[PDB]
């Protein structure tokens, strides 16, 4: 019947991020220019300012912390944040996380509305959700839809992906906008869409609040996200190559490559090794192992157990600090 | 509000279908060819299987009977059924119905969730429905919309059409998936959509459960939907169609062709003959009449009443088996 209540509790915490620049005014044959002096001057101003929108950010806390997508912010020299109550302020960048398409802004304003959070794990498919974003620069717009899926990985949008799939109409300008539950409590940040026309077709993806919060606290604190490095390229072992004692993928991922002078490469890891355990963990899935390595401390000594040439080999390696993409 | 319970009830019976083609791997200059011996070779392989996902299927029985659009399974080499719980079985095509775009698949599996059927006749415009399927290869996705309209003929997609129209986003790969009611009961099969872009624009169509079922029951029983044939080409009488034909104000079907050696040809139907009554049913509307003949059992002697040159003729024909397209 109405989501008016959810919009009233959520819409004030969503802002639209803008960028500005100066391009000269319309060229005229008789207009005084930077190069030539002519018959008339358009007043005397040389440069005119063009404001162009970048997307929408979420006001996480009332201290001025904003959450938005890295794609919205990268390449923006100056960002203006304009809230629903007409206040515009210049925001500054606390950091960025390209591996999760997230970035954090800091802003200083009195009495900022903040987004009341909600659990990402507590959503089930079929729940109504709403989308707040600035799509096409038309102004803040609310979209209603349901949760299509959870846990969307293997999209190949980012290195680390845990998307919520949504039916709500997400359009360019919705990026960094809030995906909210039926109560107005945040469940995500809208990052991307699958579209054969570049517009909404009912398949929308949002970063869930849990992953978004931990990227945000981490970006705020150490200025970035710190992750573990092993320097390995891995492919799942095939059933054809699962010929060995391991039952199919059971405790197995193949070492496709080793990073040059990488933590594993000094450790003695050689391509073709089958990783049975990383830090005494089963490691039967490449994504789960990659997440585990990311959550290991840069600098921990860990034990990799490998099977090469029918024999188990135990190796010791120093987890690195994952490099920039 | 939530549809998660209905999603829980319905999603386990919506499987995803795919086909596999062994294909030539991109070649390399320093690698052994089937005709040439070079510097290096591959360990166990010479060709690579590619999964080519077709669309969605719906489980209708614990016996293993599956409903899908005929176009999803058309010209398929191998049909693999991927269940929601991760199970994979090789499907056996049972029959296809190009006239109603329907195909039936058979799966040998224990513990199969079956779809609790609902009455499509009981649906109304403005009802809430959920479309379950596999749009763009993304994974099991559930979409929400209302029933935009009911019983849509004149679409020109199929010989026989009884289409539900939906507001729920349907996309490529959603074909063969379920359209469900708000309680999780199957009311249709997603079949076709109208789009400028190829992505859901709010106009999806699905085949209602009552029609889908008749064909499924028939395909299991015979492996062919059996339909009636009169071998007649029929046009509606419009005011100008009547004038060309020479009947000043006549209304109803007029024959424009007689299938050579079909039941009408033997019976005496002739071009220009206005059909008054088919088998004691008034043939006022062409769509009603075609469906009537379609359900008329083959090998039955029905009586066609015709108007030929302003006089009634009591023709007698032996209903035949409708040939394939």
């Amino acid at each position: 019947v109405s989501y008016a209540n959810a919009v009233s509790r959520a819409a004030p915490a969503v802002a639209n991020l803008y960028t500005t620049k100066m391009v000269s005014k319309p060229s005229h044959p008789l207009f005084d220019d930077p190069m030539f002096r002519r018959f008339f001057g358009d007043n005397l101003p040389q440069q005119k300012r063009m404001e162009s929108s970048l997307g929408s950010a979420v006001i996480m806390s009332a201290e001025g912390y904003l959450l938005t997508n890295n794609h919205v912010t990268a390449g923006a020299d100056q960002i203006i944040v304009a809230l629903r109550d007409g206040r515009e302020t210049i925001a500054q960048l606390v950091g960025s996380d390209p591996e999760t398409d997230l970035a954090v802004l800091k802003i200083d304003l009195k009495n900022l509305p903040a987004m009341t959070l909600g659990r990402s794990d507590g959503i089930r498919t079929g729940d109504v959700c709403l989308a707040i974003g600035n799509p096409f620069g038309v102004g803040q717009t609310v979209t209603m839809g349901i949760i299509s899926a959870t846990g969307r990985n293997q999209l190949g949008l980012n290195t680390y992906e845990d998307f919520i799939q949504t039916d709500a109409a997400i359009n360019p300008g919705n990026s960094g906008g809030a995906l909210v539950d039926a109560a107005g409590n945040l469940i995500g940040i809208n990052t991307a869409i699958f579209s054969k026309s570049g517009g909404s077709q009912g398949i929308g993806f949002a970063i869930p609040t849990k992953l978004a919060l931990e990227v945000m606290q981490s970006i705020i604190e150490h200025g970035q996200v710190i992750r573990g490095w092993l320097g390995v390229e891995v492919k799942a072992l095939t059933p054809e190559l699962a010929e060995s004692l391991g039952l199919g993928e059971t405790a197995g991922i193949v070492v496709a490559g080793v990073y040059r002078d990488g933590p594993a490469a000094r450790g003695g890891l050689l391509p073709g090794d089958v990783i049975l355990t990383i830090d005494k963990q089963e490691a039967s899935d490449g994504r789960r192992s990659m997440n585990q390595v990311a959550r290991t401390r840069p600098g921990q000594k860990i034990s990799i157990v490998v099977l090469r040439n029918g024999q188990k080999v135990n190796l010791t390696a120093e987890v690195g600090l994952r490099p920039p993409p | 509000v939530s549809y998660a319970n209905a999603v829980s009830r319905a999603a386990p019976a919506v499987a995803n279908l795919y086909t596999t083609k062994m294909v030539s791997k991109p070649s390399h200059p320093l690698f052994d060819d089937p005709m040439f011996r070079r510097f290096f070779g591959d360990n166990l392989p010479q060709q690579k299987r590619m999964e080519s996902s077709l669309g969605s299927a719906v489980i209708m029985s614990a016996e293993g009977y599956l409903l899908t659009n005929n176009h999803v399974t058309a010209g398929a080499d191998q049909i693999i059924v991927a269940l929601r719980d991760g199970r994979e079985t090789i499907a056996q095509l049972v029959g296809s119905d190009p006239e109603t775009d329907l195909a039936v698949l058979k799966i040998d599996l224990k513990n199969l969730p079956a779809m609790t059927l609902g009455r499509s006749d009981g649906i109304r415009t403005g009802d809430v429905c959920l479309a379950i399927g596999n749009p763009f290869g993304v994974g099991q996705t559930v979409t929400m919309g209302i029933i935009s309209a009911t019983g849509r003929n004149q679409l020109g997609l199929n010989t026989y059409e009884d289409f539900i129209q939906t507001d729920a986003a349907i996309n490529p790969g959603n074909s063969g998936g379920a359209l469900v009611d708000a309680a999780g009961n199957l009311i249709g099969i997603n079949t076709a959509i109208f789009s400028k872009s190829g992505g859901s624009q709010g106009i999806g169509f699905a085949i209602p459960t009552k029609l889908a079922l008749e064909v499924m029951q028939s395909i299991i029983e015979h492996g062919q939907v059996i339909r009636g044939w009169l071998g007649v080409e029929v046009k509606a009488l419009t005011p100008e169609l009547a004038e060309s034909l020479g009947l000043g104000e006549t209304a109803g079907i007029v024959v424009a062709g007689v299938y050579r050696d079909g039941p009408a040809a033997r019976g005496g139907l002739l071009p220009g003959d206005v059909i008054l009554t088919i088998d004691k049913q008034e043939a006022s509307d062409g769509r009603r009449s075609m469906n009537q003949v379609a359900r008329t059992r083959p090998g039955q002697k029905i009586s066609i009443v015709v108007l030929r040159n302003g006089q009634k003729v009591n023709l007698t024909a032996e209903v035949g088996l409708r040939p394939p397209p």
Partner: peptide, 7 residues
């Protein structure tokens, strides 16, 4: 169907 992970 053959994809890689770098960690």
């Amino acid at each position: 169907d053959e994809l890689r992970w770098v960690f």
